[model samples]
Target: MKLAPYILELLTSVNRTNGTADLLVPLLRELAKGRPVSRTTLAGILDWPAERVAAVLEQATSTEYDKDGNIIGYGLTLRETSYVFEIDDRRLYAWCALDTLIFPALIGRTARVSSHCAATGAPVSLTVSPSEIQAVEPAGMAVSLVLPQEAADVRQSFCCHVHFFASVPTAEDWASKHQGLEGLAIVSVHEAFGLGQEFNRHLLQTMS
Candidate 1:
């Protein structure tokens, strides 16, 4: 999806208060374990009233799961998860390779990144700073993307999963098959990060 629309969706639909983020961020780090987090269990983790857990989650633009009784998406995508960010000795996951470029800025810290070269299955690693990527092993990178029209599902059917590619031709070749996916946009990691940096700043400002 275009960064603007996604940011708008986040602003209008999600509660961006620091309190929401206080509960939200830690929950995401907890659930990054590649599993669904149940609402019944969330109450204890946050040490809040169970209804408060329900109340907070209600205002989330979460990738709700299992008939709204659970949620799986929390900045990280466990299924088809590509990007892994190691910050503060903890590993975080993201569904899209683009997240590798965006997250250091969003979290306001440096990160150690790990992922695979989409075409080669070779390991790719990076030291990403808050505003830029310091090292890319293969050096060549592209952010693969796909946005289907019938969306907001975030359940992998209609929601797009992105990847980082060492080979642009291979990514483009794969991207070609998604012609009907509509609104597809792919860019170099540099370009994606540029978009993401502004997106994070604007959304935080507007919502705050």
Candidate 2:
């Protein structure tokens, strides 16, 4: 799959974080593969000073917790985003539609994904497991996204027009309602995983 250069740039941004980017991102990917982690647990594993880890955690965008203060979301957007990533029984989240696709492979875990059509409010769901992606409704599907012309604009451009849909018509409908998204691309769910495969290799190379 030939992805927009901006998408690749966004993937790079997620990796090129500060301080303990190397150590911390891998840790987050590992957590994305399994259960929630307490700050102490993470520190013990990383063998870093507690304060240092805490400092980096402050930069994480989608950090969430239960009433018990237990982390349920890390390196993920939950409760208020286009993607909800459920893995190994933990409910995680993501920054954008592209993020949702990139992460499951990074973690090497199956994910229960749920999102909706931005135009018709039609619900979308999927089981993105290790070997396969099962689109639950509207059979096969595609996602609608509006990307910036430059990589630098991705952060500001990510949220407004990125969404999922059951078909091209729904996607186009949404685009008409939301101006600037008129140039949105409709990517099939199958094609999405193909893009995810490209991202997985990028992630593995970065880890190395």
Candidate 3:
């Protein structure tokens, strides 16, 4: 999305009210639609003086990043995961949720291998083997599973490149499951999804 026009006005307003443009973090956060940003970058985008930008950042909550030998930029801390699921880049993998229990046992190994290959920009191929289990006296259980379309596409295209992923359990499902089980399952899914998402974000930032 194009930077919102109000962001410039907000920066100027902050400068007028606070006597410095650096107090515009809240405004920038809104403009970024929750994406993390550095003070220098924000200042450049808003046409504000860097010293004033640095002064505002000094008075606000910020994280420091060393950009090679250049001056550091103030940014949101990692703990501030406000933009967790936002898709800042579409060419990367998209988000999906699946049945928790079987999903891990079924796709865990291959997903890891695929993710590794994609991160390194290496070509990869995966194979799946299903397991059968006995159930009630009248019938047994058989399940065949493969990667979903989004996962498969990511693995195919960027097996040797970076990618990210995310997963959130339905509230109803969360209420029905054991707390420990639900937490562990979601954590695993989050890791796989986060890798894909982070890779895509990095690629987009690079292009931008």
List, residue by residue over 40-147, the lDDT tens digit for candidate 1.
667777777777776776655545465555677666644445677777755666656756676666556677888887767778777878767878776767776554
User: Highest TM-score: which candidate?
Assistant: 2
Q: Which rank order by TM-score, best down to worst? A: 2, 1, 3
Q: What are the lDDT scores of the predictions, listed in order?
A: 0.62, 0.64, 0.28
Indicate the worst ten consecutive residues by lDDT in candidate 3: 136-145
What are the per-residue Cα lDDT tens digits for candidate 2 across 46-109? 7778787677766554456667665556546444566778886777777566667666665677
TM-scores across all candidates? 0.68, 0.73, 0.24
Cα lDDT tens digits, model 3, 48-165, are: 7878766655543222344442223222122222111221331111111211111223222112112111112223212211221121111111111122222223222222111212
Q: In model 2, what lDDT does residue 172 have?
A: 63
Which numbered prediction scores highest in lDDT against the true structure?
A: 2
Cα misplacement distance, residue 32 of candidate 3 (Å)? 4.2
Superior candidate under lDDT, 1 versus 3:
1
